[PDB]
Amino acid sequence: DVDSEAKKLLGLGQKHLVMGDIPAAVNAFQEAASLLGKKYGETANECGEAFFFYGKSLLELAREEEEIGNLELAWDMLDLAKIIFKRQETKEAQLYAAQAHLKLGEVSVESENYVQAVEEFQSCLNLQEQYLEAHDRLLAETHYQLGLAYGYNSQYDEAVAQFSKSIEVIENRMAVLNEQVKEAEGSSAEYKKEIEELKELLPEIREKIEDAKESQRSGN
Amino acid sequence: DVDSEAKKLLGLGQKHLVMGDIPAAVNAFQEAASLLGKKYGETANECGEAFFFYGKSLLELAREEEEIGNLELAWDMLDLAKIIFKRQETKEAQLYAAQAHLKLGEVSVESENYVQAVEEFQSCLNLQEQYLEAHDRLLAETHYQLGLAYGYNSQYDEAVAQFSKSIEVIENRMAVLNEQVKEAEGSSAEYKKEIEELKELLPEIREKIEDAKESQRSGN
């Protein structure tokens, strides 16, 4: 009924970013976020994934005018999605909440408020650093975003600090990624060798049956 | 003490097959299997891995003479290792017991007794087919060994049957192996792309610090 016709509208807006047709991506999330709100309430867990993407789109859509108008709403939405995500004890529910703070600080940057950006980016880095690997790509992406906000607020000692931490993750990641390429191409070699030898003993088995059924006829 | 000086002798005999110097590989397992027997008994679980390799070597060593003598003992040993393995409820302990029956039937083949070979190979196939994948390489290797014994006993209908089953596994395996090469080289591509893009944003971050510390000096 509702959940059905709404889950349908979510798949659209995401492939509207795939399409890049943002203005229709917004109206895709508009109605979807409206239904779940009118049905389940402004805070029920059902509306987290919805309020997030709807807020996310308004930020992208916003790129003094109606741009300042859309930021105000995009904030309110992501705040809700944050509140909706944070309260649930789930690694997935938390990283979503981290993602709320992330875009929450991106909206702060767009609105020239950098102190808040520093706060929301800090909030998001905090959460991610409980669940994710130290070499996770996201730690790098937030450290950088945070170091940008620090820089906009001309706290260069701390902006340099975050750029360092973001490089420290990016390097330590490519290390893992290289190690994973070795093991990937290494196992690809093991698998390929077995095939190239599995291939070369079916001849033996056929010339075993060739020579077997021939002995069955000869006995007759 | 004993377990220490014996576990040492096991590592030798295995790298004596790596060396291919079988006659010294036998005396490597001889003493090792003797110590654990004299300490723990002719059936204690400690002596399974030992009695197996010692039996395994005597079979290889045996390739009417002292060859017939070594087969008699190689049998007795692998029988024990079988008894020692089978009684333990462990996927690993069972596949070892399957391996006992396997070499147990190989010894039967070498001794011109094919009916027993058929039995011991059948015993081993039975066990493996509980734990292993249907595309496991071992199912193929036993089906073949069994079809050989069936052939030596000129039951060609059943020898052809086993060669078929062994081909059916070997083909269905290369299918998996091919599928695993795809995913291996596929993931190798994902990992390699991330590196080639992780590499190309450290420039951005350095020219972010370059441009950052320069603003710190300019303020001063």
Author numbering:
A (entry chain A), B (entry chain A): 38 to 100, 169 to 325
What does the paper say about this structure?
NASP is a major histone chaperone for H3–H4 dimers critical for preventing histone degradation. NASP and its homologues share an atypical tetratricopeptide repeat (TPR) domain. They constitute the SHNi-TPR (Sim3-Hif1-NASP interrupted TPR) family, predicted to have four TPR motifs with the TPR2 motif being interrupted by a long acidic region, a capping helix region immediately following the TPR4 motif, and a disordered C-terminal region containing a nuclear localization signal (NLS). Here, we report the crystal structures of the sNASP dimer, the complex of sNASP with an H3 α3 peptide, and the sNASP–H3–H4–ASF1b co-chaperone complex.
To facilitate crystallization, we made a construct containing the TPR domain and capping helix region of human sNASP with the acidic region deleted (a.a 30–340 with a deletion Δ101–159; hereafter referred to as ‘sNASP core’, sNASPc). During gel-filtration purification, sNASPc was shown to have two peaks (conformations) on the chromatogram. The extended α89 is constituted of residues from Tyr261 to Gly324 (64-residues long) of sNASPc with a kink at Glu305, and the kinked α89 helix is totally about 95 Å (65 Å + 30 Å) in length. Thus, the C-terminal one third of the α89 and α89′ helices each function like a ‘capping helix’, forming the unique architecture of a domain-swapping and dumbbell-shape dimer. The coiled-coil like interactions between α89 and α89′ constitute of totally 66 residues (33 residues from each helix), of which the predominant interactions are hydrophobic interactions and van der Waals contacts, with a few hydrogen bonds and salt bridges further stabilizing the dimer. The purified sNASPc dimer at a concentration of 5 mg/ml was crystallized in 0.2 M Calcium acetate, 0.1 M HEPES, pH 7.5, 40% v/v PEG 400, with the sitting-drop vapor-diffusion method at 20°C. The concentration of PEG 400 in the mother liquor was high enough to serve as cryoprotectant, thus all crystals were directly flash frozen in liquid nitrogen.
